[PDB]
Paper text:
It comprises a predicted β-barrel protein of the TBDR (TonB-dependent receptor) family, NanO (neuraminate outer membrane permease), adjacent to a smaller protein, NanU (extracellular neuraminate uptake protein) that has homology with the SusD family of proteins. In the present study, we present genetic, biochemical and structural data that elucidates the function of NanU as a high-affinity sialic acid-binding protein that works in concert with its cognate TBDR, NanO, in sialic acid transport. Specifically, we have established NanU as a novel member of the SusD family of proteins that binds sialic acid with a high affinity (Kd of ~400 nM). Therefore NanU, together with its partner porin NanO, forms part of an integrated sialic acid-uptake system present in several Bacteroidetes species which we suggest as the first sialic acid-specific PUL.
To characterize further the NanU protein, we determined the crystal structure of BF-NanU to a resolution of 1.6 Å. The crystal asymmetric unit shows clearly a monomeric form for the protein in agreement with our gel-filtration data, and an overall predominantly α-helical structure, reminiscent of several other members of the SusD family. We also report the structure of NanU at 1.6 Å and reveal that despite low sequence similarity with other SusD proteins (~20% at the amino acid level), there is a strongly conserved structural homology based mainly on the presence of a series of four α-helix-rich TPR units that define the scaffold for the structure of these proteins. With the exception of an extended β-ribbon and turn (Met344–Cys363) in BF-NanU and two small two-stranded anti-parallel β-sheets in SusD (Cys94–Trp96 and Ile323–Ala325 and Lys172–Phe175 and Val185–Lys188), the majority of structural differences lie within the loop regions. The α2 helix defines a motif pivoted around amino acid 50/51 (extending from Glu33 to Gly58) that is well conserved between the putative NanU proteins (residues highlighted in grey text), but not with non-sialic acid-related Sus proteins, namely SusD and BT1043 from B. thetaiotaomicron, both which are involved in oligosaccharide rather than monosaccharide binding. A second structural loop in SusD, seen to move upon substrate binding (residues 292–297), and thus provide a critical tyrosine-mediated contact, is present in BF-NanU (residues 276–280), but there are no structurally equivalent residues to the tyrosine and tryptophan residues that co-ordinate ligand in the SusD co-crystals. At present, we can only speculate as to the binding site for sialic acid, as we have tried repeatedly to produce ligand-bound crystals using various ligands with no success to date, but it seems possible that the observed differences in structure and amino acid composition may define the binding specificity of BF-NanU for monosaccharide derivatives, such as sialic acid, over the starch or oligomeric sugars observed in SusD family protein structures to date.
Numbering used by the authors: 18 to 157, 167 to 516
C-alpha cells in the first residue's frame, strides 16, 4: 500500500468529476466556518446582552455583547478557522490553472467560485482582524500584511472571479454554491467598505452601485411573498437566495450544533415552567420539541421596540415566552429566535436544526443598493420600499403608506428607542431596515462598522480603539512574526 498519499497527488486530478468533488469539498470547508461568520457579524452589537430568561449561565458568551473580549479570552480563536479553507482553495486554484482535462468554460467557472470564496474569507479577516497574513499558495515565520494590501488582494480576487464567470449569472451548481451573483454581492460590500472605511469615496460607491444593479438586471432573483418561507426547511432553493450554507441530515447541523447550543431554549424549563400568551404550557405545544441552551439572550425590550405593528418579520423572527402568575395573569418574560425552526425528523421528540444559513439574499442586494445610493446622495426610496412592502404585505402596506412607507416611518415609536431612529435620515432608515430584515443573519455588527466608529460606539459597548478582535495566545506563540491586535495591551 502507499504510505504517503496526499490530496495534491496527480491521480486525484485526472477527471472533471474529481475537480467537481474537490469543489463540493471546498464548500464543505467553508460551511465549517459558518458559526464564526455569525459571531463575527452580529453579537458584538446591540441585539443581545440580557440574562438568559431560563437560568442558564452564559459561560463567556457575554463577552461578545459586553465587548469584554481580550487577550486572555478572545471570543473566537485562530482567525475563525479561515486559513485552513483558504489553503485548500489555493490548491483548487493552482490545479485548475494547470489542468488539461477541463473545458475552458468549466475551468473558468471553477476559478470564478474559488477566487470569489477566497475574497469572501479575506474580507471577514480584514473587517475583523485588520492586518492579516496573505497566504496565496497551497502548503501541505510569516508577517501580516497591512489592511490596505489585504484590500488590494481582495479586489484582485474579485476581478479574477468576474473574469472566470464572464457573463454567466446562472447558478450552475445551485444557490448553495458560489456564483457570479455572490461575487457581485461581495463586490458591492467590498467597495462600500473601501469607499467609506478606506478613503475611496464616490468612485467606490459607484462601483458598488453598478455591481448590485447587475444582480437586479441579470440574476434570477425575486423576493419571496412570505418572509417566513425564506427560511423554511423545505424551501431551500427559493429564488430569494443568492448564496446559502447548506446544512442537511447526516451531513451537518446548523453551525455544527452551535445554533442549538446558544439560541434555542431548553426543553426541561420550557415544558415545566413557561407558557404562550394564552396561558397554554409549552408541554402542550410544538415549542415543547425545542431542546437547546440559551447563552446569548436577545434584549427583552427588543421584542416590542424593533418592529411597527403589521410587520410580519416580528413573528417570523422571534417567539415570546410567558409565565402564569400566582395571581392568574400571564406575564411576558423574554423572546427567543424563531427565524430557524428546524424540522422534526420522523419519529423524533426533539427538533433537528437543519435550516440553511443564508449568506446573501435578494433583500440584502436591495438594501445595499439603497445604501450605495444614499452614500452618493441619490434617492434610496424605491429599494427601501420594495423590502418594506414584502414585510408588511402588499395591501396592508398600500393602505398604510403615509405612516410605513419610506420616508414616513418616524415619530413617537422612536422616542426612547436606542435601537433605531426615524426615516428623517437616509442612513438611519437603511440601518433600521437592515436590523428588521436580518436579525440572526450576521449583519448588524458589520452594518454599524461600515458606517463608522461613531455609529458603533453609539449603539454598542465597543470602544473606538478595540473595533478589531484580539488574537489568542496559541496563535502568537506559533508565529513569532505576528503582533497582538492594536488596542489590546495591558
Ligand atoms: Na457605547
Amino acid at each position: 500500500i502507499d504510505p504517503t498519499s496526499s490530496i495534491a497527488d496527480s491521480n486525484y486530478w485526472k477527471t472533471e468529476a474529481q475537480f467537481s468533488t474537490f469543489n463540493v469539498g471546498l464548500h464543505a470547508l467553508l460551511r465549517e466556518c459558518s458559526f464564526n461568520f455569525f459571531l463575527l457579524g452580529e453579537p458584538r452589537a446591540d441585539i443581545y446582552g440580557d440574562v438568559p430568561f431560563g437560568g442558564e449561565a452564559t459561560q463567556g458568551m457575554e463577552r461578545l455583547p459586553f465587548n469584554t473580549i481580550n487577550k486572555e479570552n478572545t471570543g473566537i480563536s485562530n482567525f475563525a478557522g479561515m486559513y485552513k479553507v483558504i489553503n485548500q482553495i489555493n490548491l483548487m486554484i493552482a490545479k485548475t490553472k494547470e489542468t488539461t482535462v477541463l473545458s475552458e468554460a468549466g475551468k473558468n467557472y471553477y476559478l470564478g467560485e474559488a477566487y470569489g470564496m477566497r475574497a469572501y474569507l479575506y474580507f471577514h479577516l480584514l473587517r475583523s482582524w485588520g492586518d492579516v497574513i496573505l497566504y496565496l499558495d497551497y502548503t501541505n515565520s510569516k508577517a501580516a500584511s497591512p489592511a490596505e494590501e489585504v484590500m488590494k488582494q481582495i479586489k484582485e480576487d474579485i476581478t479574477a472571479s468576474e473574469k472566470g464567470f464572464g457573463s454567466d449569472y446562472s447558478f450552475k451548481y445551485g444557490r448553495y454554491y458560489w456564483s457570479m451573483a455572490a461575487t457581485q454581492m461581495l463586490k458591492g460590500e467590498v467597495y462600500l467598505w473601501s469607499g467609506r472605511q478606506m478613503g475611496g469615496g464616490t468612485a467606490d460607491y459607484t462601483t458598488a452601485k453598478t455591481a448590485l444593479q447587475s444582480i437586479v438586471s441579470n440574476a434570477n432573483v425575486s423576493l419571496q411573498d412570505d418572509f417566513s418561507k425564506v427560511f423554511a426547511y423545505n424551501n431551500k432553493d427559493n429564488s430569494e437566495i443568492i448564496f446559502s450554507i447548506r446544512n442537511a441530515k447526516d451531513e451537518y447541523n446548523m453551525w455544527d450544533d452551535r445554533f442549538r447550543q446558544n439560541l434555542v431554549p431548553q426543553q426541561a424549563y420550557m415544558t415545566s415552567t413557561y407558557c404562550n400568551k394564552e396561558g397554554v404550557s409549552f408541554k402542550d405545544l410544538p415549542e415543547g420539541q425545542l431542546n437547546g441552551l440559551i447563552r446569548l439572550q436577545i434584549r427583552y425590550d427588543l421584542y416590542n421596540k424593533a418592529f411597527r405593528d403589521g410587520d410580519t418579520r416580528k413573528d417570523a423572527s422571534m417567539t415570546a415566552v410567558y409565565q402564569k402568575q400566582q395571581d392568574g395573569t400571564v406575564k411576558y418574560i423574554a423572546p427567543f429566535c424563531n427565524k430557524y425552526q428546524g424540522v422534526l425528523l420522523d419519529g423524533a421528540s426533539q427538533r433537528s436544526f437543519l435550516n440553511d444559513y443564508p449568506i446573501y439574499r435578494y433583500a440584502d442586494c436591495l438594501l445595499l443598493l439603497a445604501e450605495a445610493k444614499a452614500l452618493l446622495g441619490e434617492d434610496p426610496t424605491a429599494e427601501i420600499n420594495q423590502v418594506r412592502e414584502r414585510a408588511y404585505g402588499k395591501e396592508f402596506f398600500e393602505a398604510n403608506k403615509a405612516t410605513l412607507a419610506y420616508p414616513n416611518d418616524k415619530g413617537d415609536f422612536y422616542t426612547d428607542n436606542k435601537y433605531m431612529s426615524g426615516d428623517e435620515d437616509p442612513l438611519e432608515a437603511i440601518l433600521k431596515e437592515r436590523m428588521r430584515e436580518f436579525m440572526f443573519e450576521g449583519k448588524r455588527w458589520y452594518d454599524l462598522r461600515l458606517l463608522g466608529a461613531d455609529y458603533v460606539t453609539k449603539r454598542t459597548s465597543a470602544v473606538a480603539t478595540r473595533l478589531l478582535w484580539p488574537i489568542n495566545e496559541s496563535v502568537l506563540t506559533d508565529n513569532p512574526a505576528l503582533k497582538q491586535t492594536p488596542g489590546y495591551q495591558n
